[PDB]
């Protein structure tokens, strides 16, 4: 995974990151990498910060606590949020307890908030769980959720499958030096040869 293009040409302003920066990642070797992207409140896109509290997304859909992530918060106006509208962000907004990260709780049933369920009537103490964002051609960037990418900094013991280094350096001859080819290290002077190897 050549993360070089992440920092080769990019203009991600207001970048925060806890742990290790994704740049210069070829130094470290691992087996599995996870980048989690999800949909959140449209008005809380600027309000996502470690700690703190809030009325929304605290007693119904709880954000992960002690989350170790790398917030690359670049605004988007052409990749997503297509003009006219969009109806794909449908999730439960009312629940009695929290929600574990990546919990797929979708049901056509009417959520019951009070002690007495409603018999499919729009009245008191009964609210529908599913909600669709009222996207408009001029809805506003403050209400249309713009994706902020975040990863998972985690460790686990396993033999590496996606892993490999690359440093590159000019090849110098006729001067003895410590050298490191692919895996094999040593010290000496390197000269041209006439030996023939098999391919």
């Amino acid at each position, epitope marked *: 995974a050549d993360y070089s293009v992440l920092y080769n040409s990019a203009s991600f302003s207001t970048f925060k990151c806890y742990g290790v920066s994704p740049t210069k990642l070829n130094d470290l070797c691992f087996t599995n990498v996870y980048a989690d992207s999800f949909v959140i409140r449209g008005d809380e896109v600027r309000q996502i910060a470690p700690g703190q509290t809030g009325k929304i997304a605290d007693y119904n859909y709880k954000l992960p606590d002690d989350f170790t992530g790398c917030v690359i918060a670049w605004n988007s106006n052409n990749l997503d949020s*297509k*003009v*006219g*509208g969009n*109806y794909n962000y*449908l999730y439960r907004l009312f629940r009695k307890s929290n929600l574990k990260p990546f919990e797929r709780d979708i049901s056509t049933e009417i959520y019951q908030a009070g002690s007495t369920p409603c018999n499919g009537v729009e009245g008191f103490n009964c609210y*529908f769980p*599913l*909600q*669709s964002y*009222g996207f408009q*051609p001029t809805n506003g960037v403050g209400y249309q959720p713009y994706r902020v990418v975040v990863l998972s900094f985690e460790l686990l013991h396993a033999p590496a499958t996606v892993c490999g280094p690359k440093k590159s350096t000019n090849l110098v001859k006729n001067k003895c030096v410590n050298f490191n080819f692919n895996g094999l290290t040593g010290t000496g002077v390197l000269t041209e040869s006439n030996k023939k190897f098999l391919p």
Partner: antibody, heavy 126, light 107 residues
Framework: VQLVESGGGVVQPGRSLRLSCAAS????????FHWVRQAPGKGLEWVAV????????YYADSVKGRFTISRDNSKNTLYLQMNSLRADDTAVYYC????????????????????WGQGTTVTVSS | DIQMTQSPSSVSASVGDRVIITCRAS??????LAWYQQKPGKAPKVLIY???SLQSGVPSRFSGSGYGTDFTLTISSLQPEDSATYYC?????????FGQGTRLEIK
């Protein structure tokens, strides 16, 4: 659902006209309207729109600057002022209505055309 | 300003025939297409909206699906009352653009 149209003119060289299309059979105050023209045998073309609240208006590229829209909830009727008449503006105009999609208790517009009127053949000559 | 195209322009079939109409958008309009059927002396009427739904009342013979750029309208049986014209329409934003038109015939 029924839309009536009126305001035809046999000849209109560079003058002012005011078309009017009414609505009946539903709530006039909870829907948005349209004006979709049609040349005699050509394709179908849209010229103007009015929002369901009436605060916002949009026109077309060759329509803006000369055509004006208006509406009234007291009479449940909207009007189109139509001016700066060229010799190539003959067409067949229609009054239309937006579809309202209801998802999760929320109503949305700008999704198609459902109700169409009889149609007015508007022509200009010299 | 999206230029929005429909094909073909002349096909003919009668009663028990299945026909296909292709329709293309210059940009990615996703699943926002409207299909109509206009009689020569009557106003056009909507058949399929949101690129997947069918208006309540239209016969279920017509069927169309699509997402993004290309869209296909399939008619299983061309009964001798559908010899009319079809127009596409993209609802991404203003201005609204219609199709060039497709004419049906009876063989």
């Amino acid at each position: 659902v029924q839309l009536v149209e009126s305001g035809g003119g046999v000849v209109q060289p560079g003058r002012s006209l005011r078309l009017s299309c009414a609505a009946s059979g539903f709530t006039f105050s909870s829907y948005a309207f349209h004006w979709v023209r049609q040349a005699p045998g050509k394709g179908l073309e849209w010229v103007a729109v009015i929002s369901y609240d009436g605060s916002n208006q949009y026109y077309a590229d060759s329509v803006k600057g000369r055509f004006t829209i208006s509406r009234d909830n007291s009479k449940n009727t909207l009007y189109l002022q139509m001016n700066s008449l060229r010799a190539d503006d003959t067409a067949v105009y229609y009054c239309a209505r937006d579809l309202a999609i209801a998802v999760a208790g929320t109503w949305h517009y700008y999704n198609g055309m459902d109700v169409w009127g009889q149609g007015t053949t508007v022509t200009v000559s010299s | 300003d999206i230029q929005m195209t429909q094909s073909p322009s002349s096909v003919s079939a009668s009663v028990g025939d299945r026909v296909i109409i292709t329709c293309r958008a210059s940009q990615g309009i996703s699943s926002w297409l409207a299909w109509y059927q206009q009689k020569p002396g009557k106003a056009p009427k909507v058949l399929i909206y949101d690129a997947s739904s069918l208006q309540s009342g239209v016969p279920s013979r017509f069927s169309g699906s699509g997402y993004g750029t290309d869209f296909t309208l399939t008619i299983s049986s061309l009964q001798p009352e559908d010899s009319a014209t079809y127009y596409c329409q993209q609802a991404k934003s203003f201005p609204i653009t219609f199709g060039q038109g497709t004419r049906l015939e009876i063989k």
